[PDB]
Protein backbone atom coordinates (compact mmCIF):
# COMPACT_ATOMS: atom_id res chain seq x y z
CA UNK A 1 0.00 0.00 0.00
CA UNK A 2 1.13 3.60 -0.78
CA UNK A 3 0.19 6.87 1.06
CA UNK A 4 2.75 9.70 0.41
CA UNK A 5 4.12 10.85 3.83
CA UNK A 6 4.53 7.17 4.86
CA UNK A 7 6.68 6.59 1.78
CA UNK A 8 9.33 8.93 3.21
CA UNK A 9 10.02 6.23 5.80
CA UNK A 10 12.78 3.84 4.61
CA UNK A 11 11.91 0.38 3.27
CA UNK A 12 10.92 -2.17 5.88
CA UNK A 13 9.70 -5.73 5.43
CA UNK A 14 7.64 -5.50 8.67
CA UNK A 15 5.92 -2.24 7.70
CA UNK A 16 5.40 -2.78 3.98
CA UNK A 17 4.80 -6.53 3.80
CA UNK A 18 3.90 -7.83 7.27
CA UNK A 19 1.89 -4.89 8.67
CA UNK A 20 0.59 -3.91 5.16
CA UNK A 21 0.21 -5.87 1.87
CA UNK A 22 3.17 -5.51 -0.53
CA UNK A 23 3.75 -6.17 -4.24
CA UNK A 24 6.42 -8.41 -5.76
CA UNK A 25 8.60 -5.39 -6.65
CA UNK A 26 8.36 -3.73 -3.24
CA UNK A 27 9.53 -7.04 -1.82
CA UNK A 28 12.11 -7.40 -4.60
CA UNK A 29 13.54 -4.02 -3.67
CA UNK A 30 13.88 -5.13 -0.06
CA UNK A 31 15.50 -8.49 -0.83
CA UNK A 32 17.33 -7.34 -4.00
CA UNK A 33 18.30 -10.86 -5.20
CA UNK A 34 15.55 -12.51 -7.28
CA UNK A 35 15.95 -15.92 -5.65
CA UNK A 36 15.71 -14.46 -2.13
CA UNK A 37 12.55 -12.66 -3.29
CA UNK A 38 10.86 -15.62 -4.93
CA UNK A 39 11.65 -17.66 -1.80
CA UNK A 40 9.73 -15.02 0.16
CA UNK A 41 6.91 -14.56 -2.32
CA UNK A 42 5.98 -18.26 -2.77
CA UNK A 43 4.54 -18.54 0.72
CA UNK A 44 3.56 -14.87 1.05
CA UNK A 45 1.46 -14.79 -2.14
CA UNK A 46 0.08 -18.31 -1.68
CA UNK A 47 -2.62 -17.38 0.79
CA UNK A 48 -4.17 -19.11 3.78
CA UNK A 49 -6.26 -22.01 2.50
CA UNK A 50 -7.47 -22.48 6.11
CA UNK A 51 -9.11 -19.01 6.25
CA UNK A 52 -12.51 -20.43 5.34
CA UNK A 53 -12.35 -22.99 8.12
CA UNK A 54 -12.67 -26.22 6.01
CA UNK A 55 -12.14 -28.62 8.95
CA UNK A 56 -15.48 -29.63 10.42
CA UNK A 57 -16.40 -31.31 13.70
CA UNK A 58 -13.76 -29.62 15.84
CA UNK A 59 -10.89 -30.37 13.50
CA UNK A 60 -7.72 -28.32 13.06
CA UNK A 61 -6.47 -26.82 9.83
CA UNK A 62 -2.78 -26.56 8.98
CA UNK A 63 -2.01 -24.49 5.91
CA UNK A 64 0.17 -25.73 3.05
CA UNK A 65 1.07 -24.33 -0.39
CA UNK A 66 -2.23 -24.19 -2.31
CA UNK A 67 -3.72 -26.69 0.16
CA UNK A 68 -4.29 -27.56 3.83
CA UNK A 69 -4.43 -30.61 6.06
CA UNK A 70 -7.20 -31.26 8.59
CA UNK A 71 -6.41 -32.88 11.95
CA UNK A 72 -9.58 -34.55 13.20
CA UNK A 73 -10.92 -35.44 16.63
CA UNK A 74 -10.96 -39.25 17.13
CA UNK A 75 -14.65 -39.69 16.11
CA UNK A 76 -14.16 -38.20 12.67
CA UNK A 77 -12.31 -38.64 9.41
CA UNK A 78 -12.29 -37.32 5.84
CA UNK A 79 -10.38 -34.46 4.17
CA UNK A 80 -12.55 -31.97 6.08
CA UNK A 81 -13.38 -34.21 9.05
CA UNK A 82 -16.92 -34.47 7.61
CA UNK A 83 -17.22 -38.24 8.19
CA UNK A 84 -18.82 -39.29 11.49
CA UNK A 85 -17.39 -42.70 12.49
CA UNK A 86 -20.44 -43.26 14.74
CA UNK A 87 -22.68 -43.25 11.66
CA UNK A 88 -20.79 -46.08 9.97
CA UNK A 89 -22.21 -49.05 11.87
CA UNK A 90 -23.40 -50.97 8.80
CA UNK A 91 -22.80 -54.59 7.76
CA UNK A 92 -20.24 -53.72 5.04
CA UNK A 93 -18.06 -51.98 7.63
CA UNK A 94 -16.15 -54.88 9.25
CA UNK A 95 -19.34 -56.96 9.51
CA UNK A 96 -21.12 -54.31 11.56
CA UNK A 97 -18.95 -55.44 14.49
CA UNK A 98 -20.89 -58.72 14.59
CA UNK A 99 -18.96 -61.89 15.46
CA UNK A 100 -21.03 -64.00 13.10
CA UNK A 101 -24.07 -62.73 11.13
CA UNK A 102 -24.99 -59.06 10.55
CA UNK A 103 -28.33 -57.68 9.38
CA UNK A 104 -28.82 -54.10 8.19
CA UNK A 105 -31.99 -52.36 9.30
CA UNK A 106 -32.46 -48.98 7.68
CA UNK A 107 -34.11 -46.34 9.85
CA UNK A 108 -32.75 -48.06 12.96
CA UNK A 109 -29.76 -50.00 14.34
CA UNK A 110 -28.15 -53.03 12.67
CA UNK A 111 -28.45 -56.33 14.51
CA UNK A 112 -26.24 -59.39 14.89
CA UNK A 113 -27.26 -63.03 14.71
CA UNK A 114 -25.54 -66.41 15.00
CA UNK A 115 -25.29 -69.68 13.10
CA UNK A 116 -27.29 -72.72 14.27
CA UNK A 117 -25.55 -74.18 17.36
CA UNK A 118 -24.77 -70.73 18.77
CA UNK A 119 -26.75 -68.03 20.53
CA UNK A 120 -26.19 -64.27 20.74
CA UNK A 121 -24.57 -62.83 23.84
CA UNK A 122 -25.69 -59.94 26.04
CA UNK A 123 -23.36 -57.57 24.23
CA UNK A 124 -25.58 -57.97 21.18
CA UNK A 125 -22.61 -58.95 18.98
CA UNK A 126 -20.86 -62.06 20.36
CA UNK A 127 -21.98 -65.67 19.81
CA UNK A 128 -21.61 -68.55 22.20
CA UNK A 129 -21.96 -72.34 21.54
CA UNK A 130 -25.25 -73.92 22.64
CA UNK A 131 -24.09 -77.46 21.78
CA UNK A 132 -21.09 -79.57 22.69
CA UNK A 133 -19.56 -79.64 19.23
CA UNK A 134 -20.56 -76.45 17.40
CA UNK A 135 -19.62 -76.18 13.72
CA UNK A 136 -16.43 -74.37 12.85
CA UNK A 137 -14.52 -74.94 16.10
CA UNK A 138 -11.48 -77.21 16.55
CA UNK A 139 -11.93 -79.04 19.92
CA UNK A 140 -8.35 -80.26 20.30
CA UNK A 141 -7.17 -76.62 20.19
CA UNK A 142 -9.56 -75.15 22.72
Amino acid sequence: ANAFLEELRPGSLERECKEEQCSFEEAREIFKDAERTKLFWISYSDGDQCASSPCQNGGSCKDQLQSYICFCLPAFEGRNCETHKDDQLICVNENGGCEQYCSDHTGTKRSCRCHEGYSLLADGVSCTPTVEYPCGKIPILE
Binding site: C91, V92, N95, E99, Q100, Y101, C102, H115, C127, E132, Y133, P134, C135, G136, K137, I138, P139, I140, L141
Partner: protein
Amino acid sequence: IVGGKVCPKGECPWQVLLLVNGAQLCGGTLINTIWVVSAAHCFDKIKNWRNLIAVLGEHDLSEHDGDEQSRRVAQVIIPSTYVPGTTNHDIALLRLHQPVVLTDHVVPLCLPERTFSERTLAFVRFSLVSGWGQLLDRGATALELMVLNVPRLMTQDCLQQSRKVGDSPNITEYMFCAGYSDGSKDSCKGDSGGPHATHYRGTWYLTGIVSWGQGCATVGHFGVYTRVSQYIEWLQKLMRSEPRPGVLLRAPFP
Protein backbone atom coordinates in the same frame (compact mmCIF):
# COMPACT_ATOMS: atom_id res chain seq x y z
CA ILE B 1 -1.72 -80.54 -1.95
CA VAL B 2 1.55 -79.18 -3.32
CA GLY B 3 3.81 -77.24 -0.93
CA GLY B 4 1.61 -77.68 2.11
CA LYS B 5 2.03 -79.15 5.58
CA VAL B 6 0.59 -82.15 7.37
CA CYS B 7 -2.63 -81.09 9.09
CA PRO B 8 -2.06 -82.21 12.70
CA LYS B 9 -4.50 -85.03 13.59
CA GLY B 10 -7.79 -83.50 14.71
CA GLU B 11 -7.05 -80.05 13.26
CA CYS B 12 -9.05 -80.47 10.02
CA PRO B 13 -12.03 -82.27 11.69
CA TRP B 14 -14.51 -81.54 8.92
CA GLN B 15 -12.37 -83.19 6.22
CA VAL B 16 -14.04 -86.20 4.57
CA LEU B 17 -12.46 -89.02 2.59
CA LEU B 18 -14.75 -90.40 -0.14
CA LEU B 19 -14.20 -93.95 -1.33
CA VAL B 20 -15.81 -95.89 -4.15
CA ASN B 21 -15.53 -99.69 -4.04
CA GLY B 22 -13.05 -99.18 -1.17
CA ALA B 23 -10.71 -96.95 -3.18
CA GLN B 24 -9.85 -93.27 -2.66
CA LEU B 25 -12.15 -91.08 -4.74
CA CYS B 26 -12.11 -87.48 -3.52
CA GLY B 27 -12.24 -85.17 -0.52
CA GLY B 28 -15.40 -83.73 1.04
CA THR B 29 -16.50 -81.39 3.86
CA LEU B 30 -18.87 -82.30 6.72
CA ILE B 31 -21.43 -79.51 7.31
CA ASN B 32 -23.64 -81.22 9.91
CA THR B 33 -24.04 -84.84 11.10
CA ILE B 34 -25.82 -86.02 7.96
CA TRP B 35 -24.55 -83.87 5.11
CA VAL B 36 -21.30 -83.62 3.14
CA VAL B 37 -20.37 -81.13 0.43
CA SER B 38 -18.05 -82.35 -2.35
CA ALA B 39 -17.35 -81.63 -6.07
CA ALA B 40 -19.66 -82.80 -8.87
CA HIS B 41 -16.75 -83.94 -11.10
CA CYS B 42 -15.84 -86.54 -8.48
CA PHE B 43 -18.85 -88.52 -9.68
CA ASP B 44 -18.28 -88.40 -13.45
CA LYS B 45 -17.06 -92.01 -13.75
CA ILE B 46 -19.23 -93.70 -11.11
CA LYS B 47 -20.99 -96.93 -12.04
CA ASN B 48 -21.44 -98.55 -8.61
CA TRP B 49 -23.55 -95.94 -6.83
CA ARG B 50 -24.33 -98.15 -3.83
CA ASN B 51 -20.58 -98.52 -3.17
CA LEU B 52 -19.79 -94.97 -1.96
CA ILE B 53 -18.35 -94.50 1.52
CA ALA B 54 -17.59 -91.32 3.45
CA VAL B 55 -14.89 -91.56 6.14
CA LEU B 56 -14.71 -88.93 8.90
CA GLY B 57 -11.88 -88.63 11.46
CA GLU B 58 -9.37 -89.96 8.97
CA HIS B 59 -5.77 -88.78 9.12
CA ASP B 60 -3.23 -91.42 8.07
CA LEU B 61 -4.49 -93.68 5.24
CA SER B 62 -1.99 -96.42 6.15
CA GLU B 63 -3.26 -96.86 9.73
CA HIS B 64 -6.70 -97.28 11.25
CA ASP B 65 -7.53 -95.87 14.69
CA GLY B 66 -10.63 -95.38 16.83
CA ASP B 67 -11.36 -91.88 15.56
CA GLU B 68 -12.39 -93.02 12.07
CA GLN B 69 -16.07 -93.36 11.30
CA SER B 70 -17.40 -94.73 8.03
CA ARG B 71 -20.88 -94.15 6.64
CA ARG B 72 -22.69 -95.30 3.50
CA VAL B 73 -23.53 -92.50 1.06
CA ALA B 74 -27.29 -92.67 0.51
CA GLN B 75 -27.68 -89.78 -1.94
CA VAL B 76 -25.49 -87.69 -4.22
CA ILE B 77 -27.21 -84.49 -5.29
CA ILE B 78 -25.76 -82.53 -8.20
CA PRO B 79 -27.03 -79.39 -10.03
CA SER B 80 -28.89 -80.44 -13.20
CA THR B 81 -27.02 -77.54 -14.88
CA TYR B 82 -23.67 -79.29 -14.30
CA VAL B 83 -22.20 -80.90 -17.40
CA PRO B 84 -19.84 -83.92 -16.90
CA GLY B 85 -16.43 -83.24 -18.38
CA THR B 86 -16.73 -79.49 -17.70
CA THR B 87 -16.05 -77.05 -14.84
CA ASN B 88 -19.16 -74.96 -14.05
CA HIS B 89 -21.44 -75.81 -11.09
CA ASP B 90 -18.87 -78.17 -9.61
CA ILE B 91 -20.72 -79.02 -6.41
CA ALA B 92 -22.30 -82.17 -4.95
CA LEU B 93 -24.41 -82.53 -1.77
CA LEU B 94 -24.22 -86.00 -0.18
CA ARG B 95 -26.62 -87.51 2.33
CA LEU B 96 -25.10 -90.05 4.73
CA HIS B 97 -27.17 -93.17 5.48
CA GLN B 98 -26.74 -92.73 9.23
CA PRO B 99 -25.34 -89.69 11.03
CA VAL B 100 -21.76 -89.56 12.17
CA VAL B 101 -21.12 -89.01 15.84
CA LEU B 102 -19.52 -85.65 16.64
CA THR B 103 -16.22 -86.06 18.50
CA ASP B 104 -12.97 -84.15 19.14
CA HIS B 105 -11.87 -85.52 15.75
CA VAL B 106 -15.12 -85.17 13.78
CA VAL B 107 -16.69 -81.71 13.73
CA PRO B 108 -18.75 -80.09 10.98
CA LEU B 109 -17.59 -76.91 9.15
CA CYS B 110 -20.16 -74.08 9.25
CA LEU B 111 -22.06 -73.52 6.02
CA PRO B 112 -22.46 -69.71 6.12
CA GLU B 113 -25.29 -67.41 5.03
CA ARG B 114 -24.86 -65.99 1.52
CA THR B 115 -24.65 -62.29 2.34
CA PHE B 116 -22.17 -62.78 5.21
CA SER B 117 -20.08 -64.95 2.88
CA GLU B 118 -20.19 -62.46 0.00
CA ARG B 119 -19.52 -59.26 1.94
CA THR B 120 -17.35 -60.49 4.77
CA LEU B 121 -15.78 -63.95 4.20
CA ALA B 122 -14.93 -63.12 0.60
CA PHE B 123 -12.58 -60.40 1.82
CA VAL B 124 -10.66 -62.45 4.37
CA ARG B 125 -7.33 -62.92 2.54
CA PHE B 126 -6.23 -66.41 3.51
CA SER B 127 -8.13 -69.69 3.86
CA LEU B 128 -7.11 -73.35 4.24
CA VAL B 129 -7.39 -76.02 1.54
CA SER B 130 -6.82 -79.67 2.42
CA GLY B 131 -6.72 -83.25 1.20
CA TRP B 132 -4.83 -86.47 0.47
CA GLY B 133 -4.19 -85.46 -3.13
CA GLN B 134 -0.95 -85.35 -5.12
CA LEU B 135 2.11 -83.87 -3.43
CA LEU B 136 3.38 -82.84 -6.89
CA ASP B 137 1.66 -82.30 -10.24
CA ARG B 138 1.23 -85.80 -11.67
CA GLY B 139 3.02 -87.11 -8.57
CA ALA B 140 2.03 -89.56 -5.81
CA THR B 141 -0.84 -88.87 -3.43
CA ALA B 142 -0.45 -88.21 0.31
CA LEU B 143 -0.76 -90.77 3.15
CA GLU B 144 -1.27 -88.12 5.87
CA LEU B 145 -3.84 -85.32 5.49
CA MET B 146 -2.24 -82.20 4.01
CA VAL B 147 -3.32 -78.57 4.51
CA LEU B 148 -2.30 -75.32 2.77
CA ASN B 149 -2.95 -71.60 3.36
CA VAL B 150 -3.98 -69.79 0.17
CA PRO B 151 -4.85 -66.16 -0.59
CA ARG B 152 -8.09 -65.35 -2.47
CA LEU B 153 -8.27 -63.25 -5.62
CA MET B 154 -11.15 -61.39 -7.23
CA THR B 155 -11.67 -62.83 -10.72
CA GLN B 156 -10.52 -59.73 -12.62
CA ASP B 157 -7.14 -59.94 -10.85
CA CYS B 158 -7.00 -63.69 -11.41
CA LEU B 159 -7.51 -63.20 -15.16
CA GLN B 160 -5.04 -60.35 -15.35
CA GLN B 161 -2.39 -62.35 -13.46
CA SER B 162 -2.82 -65.63 -15.29
CA ARG B 163 -0.72 -66.76 -18.22
CA LYS B 164 -2.89 -67.14 -21.34
CA VAL B 165 -3.73 -70.72 -22.29
CA GLY B 166 -5.86 -71.45 -25.35
CA ASP B 167 -9.22 -73.26 -24.97
CA SER B 168 -9.05 -72.78 -21.16
CA PRO B 169 -12.32 -72.74 -19.17
CA ASN B 170 -14.04 -69.46 -18.34
CA ILE B 171 -13.91 -68.51 -14.68
CA THR B 172 -17.62 -67.97 -13.98
CA GLU B 173 -19.41 -66.25 -11.10
CA TYR B 174 -19.78 -69.76 -9.61
CA MET B 175 -16.01 -69.92 -9.11
CA PHE B 176 -13.10 -68.00 -7.61
CA CYS B 177 -9.30 -68.26 -7.72
CA ALA B 178 -6.99 -68.74 -4.78
CA GLY B 179 -3.36 -69.63 -4.54
CA TYR B 180 -0.01 -68.64 -5.98
CA SER B 181 1.17 -68.28 -9.59
CA ASP B 182 4.85 -68.92 -8.74
CA GLY B 183 4.63 -72.72 -8.94
CA SER B 184 5.08 -73.27 -5.20
CA LYS B 185 1.73 -74.05 -3.61
CA ASP B 186 -1.68 -75.26 -4.80
CA SER B 187 -4.26 -78.01 -4.24
CA CYS B 188 -4.29 -80.84 -6.79
CA LYS B 189 -6.36 -83.56 -8.48
CA GLY B 190 -6.96 -85.90 -5.53
CA ASP B 191 -7.87 -82.93 -3.35
CA SER B 192 -11.04 -82.37 -5.42
CA GLY B 193 -14.20 -81.95 -3.36
CA GLY B 194 -12.19 -80.93 -0.30
CA PRO B 195 -12.77 -77.74 1.77
CA HIS B 196 -11.55 -74.19 1.26
CA ALA B 197 -12.22 -73.07 4.83
CA THR B 198 -12.25 -69.50 6.04
CA HIS B 199 -11.49 -68.43 9.63
CA TYR B 200 -13.45 -65.38 10.79
CA ARG B 201 -13.79 -64.07 14.35
CA GLY B 202 -13.13 -67.48 15.93
CA THR B 203 -15.18 -69.72 13.66
CA TRP B 204 -14.44 -71.54 10.44
CA TYR B 205 -16.78 -71.48 7.44
CA LEU B 206 -17.11 -73.25 4.10
CA THR B 207 -16.33 -70.82 1.26
CA GLY B 208 -15.03 -73.01 -1.51
CA ILE B 209 -14.59 -76.52 -2.85
CA VAL B 210 -11.43 -77.79 -4.52
CA SER B 211 -12.49 -77.87 -8.19
CA TRP B 212 -9.94 -77.32 -11.01
CA GLY B 213 -6.74 -75.72 -12.28
CA GLN B 214 -4.14 -75.75 -15.04
CA GLY B 215 -2.11 -78.62 -13.68
CA CYS B 216 -1.11 -78.14 -10.04
CA ALA B 217 1.13 -75.29 -8.86
CA THR B 218 1.80 -74.31 -12.47
CA VAL B 219 3.62 -71.00 -13.02
CA GLY B 220 1.21 -68.30 -14.23
CA HIS B 221 -1.81 -70.09 -12.72
CA PHE B 222 -3.98 -70.31 -9.58
CA GLY B 223 -6.27 -72.99 -8.18
CA VAL B 224 -9.95 -72.52 -9.03
CA TYR B 225 -12.66 -73.17 -6.45
CA THR B 226 -16.45 -73.51 -6.53
CA ARG B 227 -17.97 -70.33 -5.01
CA VAL B 228 -20.12 -71.92 -2.31
CA SER B 229 -21.96 -68.62 -1.58
CA GLN B 230 -23.88 -69.08 -4.85
CA TYR B 231 -25.27 -72.34 -3.55
CA ILE B 232 -26.41 -71.60 0.03
CA GLU B 233 -30.16 -71.57 -0.76
CA TRP B 234 -29.86 -74.55 -3.12
CA LEU B 235 -28.01 -76.57 -0.42
CA GLN B 236 -30.37 -75.59 2.41
CA LYS B 237 -33.50 -76.46 0.47
CA LEU B 238 -32.15 -79.84 -0.54
CA MET B 239 -31.05 -80.69 2.99
CA ARG B 240 -34.71 -80.30 3.98
CA SER B 241 -35.77 -82.76 1.25
CA GLU B 242 -37.02 -86.32 1.71
CA PRO B 243 -34.81 -89.19 0.55
CA ARG B 244 -35.33 -90.75 -2.90
CA PRO B 245 -34.92 -94.35 -4.11
CA GLY B 246 -31.86 -93.94 -6.35
CA VAL B 247 -28.53 -92.52 -5.24
CA LEU B 248 -27.89 -89.83 -7.85
CA LEU B 249 -30.31 -86.91 -7.99
CA ARG B 250 -29.87 -84.17 -10.55
CA ALA B 251 -31.70 -81.30 -8.85
CA PRO B 252 -32.69 -78.00 -10.53
CA PHE B 253 -30.39 -75.01 -10.08
CA PRO B 254 -31.21 -72.30 -8.98
